[PDB]
Amino acid sequence: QWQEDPEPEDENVYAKNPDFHGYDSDPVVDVWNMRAVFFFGFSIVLVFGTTFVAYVPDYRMQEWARREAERLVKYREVNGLPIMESNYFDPSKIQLPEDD
Amino acid sequence: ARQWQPDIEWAEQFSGAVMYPSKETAHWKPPPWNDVDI
Amino acid sequence: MLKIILPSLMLLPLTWLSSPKKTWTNVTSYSFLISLTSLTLLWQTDENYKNFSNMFSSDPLSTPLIILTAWLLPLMLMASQNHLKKDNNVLQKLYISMLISLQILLIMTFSATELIMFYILFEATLIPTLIIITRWGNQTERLNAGIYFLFYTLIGSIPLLIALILIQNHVGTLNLMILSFTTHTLDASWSNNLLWLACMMAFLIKMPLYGVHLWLPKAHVEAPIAGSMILAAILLKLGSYGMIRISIILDPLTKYMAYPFILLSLWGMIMTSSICLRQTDLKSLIAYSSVSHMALVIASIMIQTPWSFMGATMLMIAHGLTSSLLFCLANSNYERIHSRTMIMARGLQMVFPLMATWWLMASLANLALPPSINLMGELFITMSLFSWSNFTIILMGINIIITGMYSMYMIITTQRGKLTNHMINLQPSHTRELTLMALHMIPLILLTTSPKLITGLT
Amino acid sequence: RYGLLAAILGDKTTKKLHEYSRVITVDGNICSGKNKLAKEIAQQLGMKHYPEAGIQYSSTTTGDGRPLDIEFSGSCSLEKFYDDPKSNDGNSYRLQSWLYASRLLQYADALEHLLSTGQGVVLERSIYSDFVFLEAMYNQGYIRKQCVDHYNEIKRLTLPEYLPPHAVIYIDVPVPEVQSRIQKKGDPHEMKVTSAYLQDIENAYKKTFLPKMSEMCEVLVYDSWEAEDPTKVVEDIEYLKYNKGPWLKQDDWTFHYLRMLVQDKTEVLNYTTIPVYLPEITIGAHQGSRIYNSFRELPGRKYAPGYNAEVGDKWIWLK
Amino acid sequence: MNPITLAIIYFTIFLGPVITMSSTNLMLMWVGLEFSLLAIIPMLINKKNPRSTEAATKYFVTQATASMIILLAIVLNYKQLGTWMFQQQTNGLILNMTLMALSMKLGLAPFHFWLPEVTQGIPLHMGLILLTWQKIAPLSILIQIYPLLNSTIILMLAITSIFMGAWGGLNQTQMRKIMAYSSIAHMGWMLAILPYNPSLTLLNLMIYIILTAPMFMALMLNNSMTINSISLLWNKTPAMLTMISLMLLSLGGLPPLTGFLPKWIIITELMKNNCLIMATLMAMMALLNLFFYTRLIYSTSLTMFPTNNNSKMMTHQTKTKPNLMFSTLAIMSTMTLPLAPQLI
Amino acid sequence: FYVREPVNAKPNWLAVGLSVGASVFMWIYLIQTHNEDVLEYKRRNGL
Amino acid sequence: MPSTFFNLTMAFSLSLLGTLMFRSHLMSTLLCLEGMVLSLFIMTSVTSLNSNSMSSMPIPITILVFAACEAAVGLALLVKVSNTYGTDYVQNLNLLQ
Amino acid sequence: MNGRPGHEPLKFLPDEARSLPPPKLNDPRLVYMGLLGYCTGLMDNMLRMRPVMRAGLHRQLLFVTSFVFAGYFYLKRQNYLYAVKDHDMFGYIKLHPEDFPEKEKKTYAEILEPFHPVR
Amino acid sequence: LFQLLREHWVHILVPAGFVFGCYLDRKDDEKLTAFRNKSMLFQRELRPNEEVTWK
Numbered sequence A: 001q002w003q004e005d006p007e008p009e010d011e012n013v014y015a016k017n018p019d020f021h022g023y024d025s026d027p028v029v030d031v032w033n034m035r036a037v038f039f040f041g042f043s044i045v046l047v048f049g050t051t052f053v054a055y056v057p058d059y060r061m062q063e064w065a066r067r068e069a070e071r072l073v074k075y076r077e078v079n080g081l082p083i084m085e086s087n088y089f090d091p092s093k094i095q096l097p098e099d100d
Numbered sequence B: 001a002r003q004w005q006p007d008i009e010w011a012e013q014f015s016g017a018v019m020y021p022s023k024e025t026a027h028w029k030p031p032p033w034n035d036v037d038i
Numbered sequence C: 001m002l003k004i005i006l007p008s009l010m011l012l013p014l015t016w017l018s019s020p021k022k023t024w025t026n027v028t029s030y031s032f033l034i035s036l037t038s039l040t041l042l043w044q045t046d047e048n049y050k051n052f053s054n055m056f057s058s059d060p061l062s063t064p065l066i067i068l069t070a071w072l073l074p075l076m077l078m079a080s081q082n083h084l085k086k087d088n089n090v091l092q093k094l095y096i097s098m099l100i101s102l103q104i105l106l107i108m109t110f111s112a113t114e115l116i117m118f119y120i121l122f123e124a125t126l127i128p129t130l131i132i133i134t135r136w137g138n139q140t141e142r143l144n145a146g147i148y149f150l151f152y153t154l155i156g157s158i159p160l161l162i163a164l165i166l167i168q169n170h171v172g173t174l175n176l177m178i179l180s181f182t183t184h185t186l187d188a189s190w191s192n193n194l195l196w197l198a199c200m201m202a203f204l205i206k207m208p209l210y211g212v213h214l215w216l217p218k219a220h221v222e223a224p225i226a227g228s229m230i231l232a233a234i235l236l237k238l239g240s241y242g243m244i245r246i247s248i249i250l251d252p253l254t255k256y257m258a259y260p261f262i263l264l265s266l267w268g269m270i271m272t273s274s275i276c277l278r279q280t281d282l283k284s285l286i287a288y289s290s291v292s293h294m295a296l297v298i299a300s301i302m303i304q305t306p307w308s309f310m311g312a313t314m315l316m317i318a319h320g321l322t323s324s325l326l327f328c329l330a331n332s333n334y335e336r337i338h339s340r341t342m343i344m345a346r347g348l349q350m351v352f353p354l355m356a357t358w359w360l361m362a363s364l365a366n367l368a369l370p371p372s373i374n375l376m377g378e379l380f381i382t383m384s385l386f387s388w389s390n391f392t393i394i395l396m397g398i399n400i401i402i403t404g405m406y407s408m409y410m411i412i413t414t415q416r417g418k419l420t421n422h423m424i425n426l427q428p429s430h431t432r433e434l435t436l437m438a439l440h441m442i443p444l445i446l447l448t449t450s451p452k453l454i455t456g457l458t
Numbered sequence D: 001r002y003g004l005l006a007a008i009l010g011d012k013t014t015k016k017l018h019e020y021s022r023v024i025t026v027d028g029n030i031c032s033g034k035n036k037l038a039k040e041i042a043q044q045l046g047m048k049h050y051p052e053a054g055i056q057y058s059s060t061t062t063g064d065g066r067p068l069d070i071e072f073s074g075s076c077s078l079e080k081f082y083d084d085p086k087s088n089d090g091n092s093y094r095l096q097s098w099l100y101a102s103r104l105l106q107y108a109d110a111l112e113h114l115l116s117t118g119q120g121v122v123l124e125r126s127i128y129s130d131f132v133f134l135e136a137m138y139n140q141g142y143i144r145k146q147c148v149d150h151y152n153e154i155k156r157l158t159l160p161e162y163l164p165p166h167a168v169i170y171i172d173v174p175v176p177e178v179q180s181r182i183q184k185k186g187d188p189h190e191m192k193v194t195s196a197y198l199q200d201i202e203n204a205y206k207k208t209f210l211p212k213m214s215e216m217c218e219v220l221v222y223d224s225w226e227a228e229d230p231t232k233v234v235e236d237i238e239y240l241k242y243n244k245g246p247w248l249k250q251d252d253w254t255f256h257y258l259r260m261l262v263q264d265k266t267e268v269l270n271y272t273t274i275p276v277y278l279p280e281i282t283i284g285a286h287q288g289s290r291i292y293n294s295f296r297e298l299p300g301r302k303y304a305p306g307y308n309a310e311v312g313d314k315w316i317w318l319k
Numbered sequence E: 001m002n003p004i005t006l007a008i009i010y011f012t013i014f015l016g017p018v019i020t021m022s023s024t025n026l027m028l029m030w031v032g033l034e035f036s037l038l039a040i041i042p043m044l045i046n047k048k049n050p051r052s053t054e055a056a057t058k059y060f061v062t063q064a065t066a067s068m069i070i071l072l073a074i075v076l077n078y079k080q081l082g083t084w085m086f087q088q089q090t091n092g093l094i095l096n097m098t099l100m101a102l103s104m105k106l107g108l109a110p111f112h113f114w115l116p117e118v119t120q121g122i123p124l125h126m127g128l129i130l131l132t133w134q135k136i137a138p139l140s141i142l143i144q145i146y147p148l149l150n151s152t153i154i155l156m157l158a159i160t161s162i163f164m165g166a167w168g169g170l171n172q173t174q175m176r177k178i179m180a181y182s183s184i185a186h187m188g189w190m191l192a193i194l195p196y197n198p199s200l201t202l203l204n205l206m207i208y209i210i211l212t213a214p215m216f217m218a219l220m221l222n223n224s225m226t227i228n229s230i231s232l233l234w235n236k237t238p239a240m241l242t243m244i245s246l247m248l249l250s251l252g253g254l255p256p257l258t259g260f261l262p263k264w265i266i267i268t269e270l271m272k273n274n275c276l277i278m279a280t281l282m283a284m285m286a287l288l289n290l291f292f293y294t295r296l297i298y299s300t301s302l303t304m305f306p307t308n309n310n311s312k313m314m315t316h317q318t319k320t321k322p323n324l325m326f327s328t329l330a331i332m333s334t335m336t337l338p339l340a341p342q343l344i
Numbered sequence F: 001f002y003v004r005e006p007v008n009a010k011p012n013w014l015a016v017g018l019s020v021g022a023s024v025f026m027w028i029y030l031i032q033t034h035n036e037d038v039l040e041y042k043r044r045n046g047l
Numbered sequence G: 001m002p003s004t005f006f007n008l009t010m011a012f013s014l015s016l017l018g019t020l021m022f023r024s025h026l027m028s029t030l031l032c033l034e035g036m037v038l039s040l041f042i043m044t045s046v047t048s049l050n051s052n053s054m055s056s057m058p059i060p061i062t063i064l065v066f067a068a069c070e071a072a073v074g075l076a077l078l079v080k081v082s083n084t085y086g087t088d089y090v091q092n093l094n095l096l097q
Numbered sequence H: 001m002n003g004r005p006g007h008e009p010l011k012f013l014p015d016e017a018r019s020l021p022p023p024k025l026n027d028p029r030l031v032y033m034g035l036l037g038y039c040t041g042l043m044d045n046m047l048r049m050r051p052v053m054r055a056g057l058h059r060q061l062l063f064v065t066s067f068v069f070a071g072y073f074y075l076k077r078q079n080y081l082y083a084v085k086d087h088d089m090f091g092y093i094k095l096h097p098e099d100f101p102e103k104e105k106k107t108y109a110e111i112l113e114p115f116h117p118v119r
Numbered sequence I: 001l002f003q004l005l006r007e008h009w010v011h012i013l014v015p016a017g018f019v020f021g022c023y024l025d026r027k028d029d030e031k032l033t034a035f036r037n038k039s040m041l042f043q044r045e046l047r048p049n050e051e052v053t054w055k
């Protein structure tokens, strides 16, 4: 037979290091590889990130447009103009193909 | 449990003077390693 | 956007220079913060998109992804610390670097103004991925899987190369900004009808369409967990991002040149969803789940209605996170079980109480439970598809019923029923396994609170 | 490194060959007196003396020179050769193939000393004589036919390039008397060896090795009595005329290329690693990777000679 | 080789291409081609193995008849124009025969059969000189006659070489044979853009030289003429496994590496000139070339083939340091795509 | 140590001095070229 | 002159067909190969002579000098072949397949 | 191109290239060439089996400093070549003006691109 | 201070990238500064003792 190794068993890392956190076999590296992963993972990304993302102001202008509507609807209604006129680019500006 | 490293048989195919050997194409056997013929 | 990128490059020096024992924590801890710098791009207080500089830009469609691409590198490096912890200390530092380059390249591809910059970076991502799948792939067939993943993408890629060089001559620059504000209206010739297919086909291939999706089941099967996460979460979505930015040109033809794909995808959605119903390999079932839920996306990036695109952007980010979560937990069962078979390992909740809660939430994300971005996404694509033709609900209606069935079957035959008598005893759950999951779902819960951020360009 | 430049600007081996400059090798037979005569012939004629090739001869050759672990040296046991003939794992063929590689290294190191220093060479058994062990092994059940073909292929590919032994000495003692010589030798593995197997070894020499080398190189046959008398044998060597043989055509410009070969050990045995996959020879990727990824981590071996600090190398930052 | 002879030959093998390039009198260009033919034949039979004599006798007959055809073109021109050199007026057949003969010398496509056979049975070092240094002298003549040669003839010569080179590569497992089948394809890309952008013809050559020269000095570092032989690279010398991987994928057109630029700009120039028929088919089968490149990748790097026990012995003795330039051109190849604008 | 000593154990002090010294000649020519260049550019054009 | 040039040119093509259609012994080929050099030498000399272009007569001979050595190399390969096979038939030159 | 008037038959960079600005030594490209070089050096050490980064610190320098040296003087030229291209291109546009007339597109108001509805 | 043995030599690699990154992204601005304040929607006139609108 062609020489090759006998199947390597998978160790019960939980037999020694009964506090195994799943990162590395020797205990101190494990502890310091979860004390830095829960922290940088949860403690300052899911928390500081969500804080910053929550405070992004008027994202994509949708906080601005609910007022500009309100003053346009305030202005258009009181002055009697149609609230959403039916052509946007004014007809006067357009130079329609004359013949057709 | 071991990413399967190639066995002898997987290796075998790459021998032979042509990868895809057809009829009267397997007749060809690999050239001498020394580059010298008998 | 060179903080999301330069600091990333520097990760490579850190994976190499750092101590063999401390290499893992330096890399994972630092890219978590790299994700935090990525969050700055989300600060868009105005419609004008952010053109950082000539070559690098980020608009609503790319920003939700760049953050996901940066987010998964930490997770990928945490899910592969177990397998790949049996290596020689230089095989690891190669795997870690390979994972690092994927998001460096993927961050740039998603944040690229010039479409051919997309192509060069687009097709480069195959190099890192093929190495991850072939070199560390457990099964005898990864050499084959790698071939399938390289050729299907490559044969699609060279047509796009010819097409983009073609439009540069026709218009005079491949700059996505200009191409948008310039008049490029195809003329429904027979040739243009080919151009359109040339540009979309390469994107349609890596976004598995029903016709060419055989590469994805084969690739994720033997791929290591980190490669399977990357393929499902970021790699497949590269095809969707491309279809959104490339169909700005080729505006007139897709009105009538899409029918073929749309029907291929919706019928494909049903058959891909159904074969999930009886597939013995769990990783196999998640992969076909990925094909079907991505077949919905190619059917919304082609109908081209504002809501479709918005549904697509919602679903792509959401399904990306969910799929990985499913691929990540599949791996945890695979490593203790040592087999991909779904029938073995029955009853796990009895022995792994929490992983089962993660399994349940992942499945509910997989099927459309309502207070989830996953449902909002499908609800929207469903609406537009209905607008395209009221009949579409029938086919997008057989998929919803099937999607419920396979999603729960994964929970019912893997995480319930009587425990398997005595497989190699299943060691308890590591805290890494559980966090790798928590890190996937906690963002899924947070994004569902404010869906606006992943809402697309439309 | 010795190179044409040296040659163009000197370094012509032709200007260093003396009357005693020859490749003398005593093929001998097992437990015979091959070594004593050799060490002596070396002593009186002033020729370099090279010991019989060993499992760890290559390790003594390279780097520290401390003996390597068995698996690092190819996992070959002459000891296991004897106690377990026709073994399932084939340690006997692996032993023979490593032995051929070891003498290939020894013969090449010998030729390098001969062409550089000009001191003549005594190396005991040679690659040319190695075949007798395999012939006897195939004669009995030790090795199967293909195994033989694989050794012959390696021999045909590498041995012709090297120049032949100038003269060969044959210290012959009969099949029965070597076994009694073996009997008082202390090791038990040498004892209990097949009389017929020893029969096949010396028969293979007499039938093939001598006559073969009779035409090509100066073949001197000595009986045991002539042996144990290094003086007389030495005398006869000094007596033979080094004429017949391929060595006659070795002009300086021809030696240069041969020198540059032996000067490169990685080539000397390049064809020794030919990718012919017979089962005994195959490392196997998982075992081989571990053995390499372990041999390469030994102190002074991680990096090239001169660059590994473990053993005390310095100046690496400017080398 | 008496070092004097080595000098005379090597000088001729080097004066051969240089006279061709420097002179304008075609005649002097022909003898430059003639000297290259005479100088290469001695080196080809250095081992003098039975395979070698076959190699040289083929190379010589193929080279000689082509040389005679090139001379006939010059002789004919001399009577259609007193000049000893091709001009706008030159009869089209005069140029076409020149095109066929030099393609014969380059073994570009229809005459591609001689190149794999000649490359097999000659030492790898001479094989590198045959595939790279010998090729420059014929193309220098073609670059000079750039405007005159007809577009249709070389376009089909180019498409034929891409197809034959790619097909030859998949079946061949003989490493040196594989190097020849890529050079036929790469030569096809070079001539495809020859009537259009000669600068790009040259670029597609240099890059081929900066790619093939490292690749061959890699094959010989372990002197492996078999893929099985290069596959055990992981045991003999592990570091070259990384760059051998990238250089071979660079030889094929994959985008991050330097190898994409030659194909990319040739395609850009052909589309600029409207050959979007021809360019497309070329790029597509160009993809076939990568398949056989990656199959080798598989055997040498991505998968570890089993090795013989004697390999441990070769690891022991100190390894031959690879050449200083192997390292510089290995990084020059595979890593200079960011420097592409200045290259063209 | 080694039975067969390395050829590189004590540095090839020539290879240092032509490697170090060559590079320092490169810079002093390169930096010179730039400032010299900048000037030529300035005077050849307006400034 | 044009008629003579036609004959010489076809002579070169008939010699071309010869060297491109081997049959047994190689020495035939090399011999044919030489038939071309003669035809080229004759044509070059002829036109140079009726163009009174004396500045070019050097060429007719340079052609022969280079062609002679070219042939010398060719024959040494031929002798090398019937030393390794001893029959000089293009037939046995197939090891490289 | 060649044949262009005044062409220097074998020169590297004609003095006319003096007029162009010199490449800033820290131009990203020259800096790349530097890194390209350092890597060559590191690679060499690796292929020759030496401590990768702690060896040949003299060579490291030769490499990073050879590649860079080459760059400034190459880029200096490639820069010129490109600059010639404009001199040449822009000039022609004028000398042959009629062939490159200045089109005058109409404000969208006037032009009427057809509208394909998505519906 | 650059404590060795991967003490601060390495830990400062990635962070430094960030700074360099920010140094470039604020340098890109410096280049793309035409239309500094010449845009139509935002073309205010310079307020007293203010050098330029956006830097």
Ligand SMILES: CCCCCCCCCCCCCCCCCC(=O)OC[C@H](COP(=O)(O)OCCN)OC(=O)CCCCCCCCCCCCCCCCC
Pocket (backbone or CB within 6 Å): A045, A046, A049, A050, A053, A054, C035, C039, C042, C063, C064, C065, C067, C068, C071, C317, C361, C364, C365, C369, C371, C372, C443, C444, C445, C446, C447, C448, C449, C450, C451, C452, C453, C454
């Ligand atoms: C970004 C692109 C994608 C990136 C993916 C990966 C990113 C990982 C790294 C970054 C992680 C943090 C950033 C992403 C999360 C952002 C969270 C967020 O934006 O919260 C906003 C919310 C304010 O609400 P807002 O939408 O502004 O108000 C609406 C006014 N009309 O502020 C809050 O209310 C915070 C509340 C915290 C707790 C909320 C829990 C609510 C759960 C509700 C659903 C429960 C059921 C879910 C079922 C799911 C089933 C699968």
Ligand SMILES: CCCCCCCCCCCCCCCCCC(=O)OC[C@H](COP(=O)(O)OCCN)OC(=O)CCCCCCCCCCCCCCCCC
Pocket (backbone or CB within 6 Å): C012, C090, C094, C097, C098, C101, C104, C105, C124, C127, C128, C131, C135, D293, D296, E238, E239, E241, E242, E245, E246, E256, E301, E302, H046
């Ligand atoms: C655009 C990016 C494209 C993708 C880039 C990343 C992938 C590059 C392609 C890799 C192809 C080969 C993959 C398999 C290689 C296997 C190498 C191996 O097995 O390791 C052994 C080798 C030699 O070992 P040695 O260093 O002597 O020490 C250990 C002795 N046993 O030691 C080694 O070979 C490992 C170390 C090699 C040198 C370091 C290379 C690390 C990867 C650097 C990637 C940089 C990516 C930059 C991305 C930028 C994107 C714009």
Ligand SMILES: Nc1ncnc2c1ncn2[C@@H]1O[C@H](COP(=O)(O)OP(=O)(O)O)[C@@H](O)[C@H]1O
Pocket (backbone or CB within 6 Å): D029, D030, D031, D032, D033, D034, D035, D052, D078, D096, D099, D133, D134, D185, D190
């Ligand atoms: N290829 C081989 N086959 C069998 N035995 C070998 C081989 N190579 C070396 N040997 C062993 O080397 C030994 C050398 O013997 P020697 O030193 O003369 O006396 P002793 O037998 O007392 O050691 C032999 O006995 C033989 O067993």
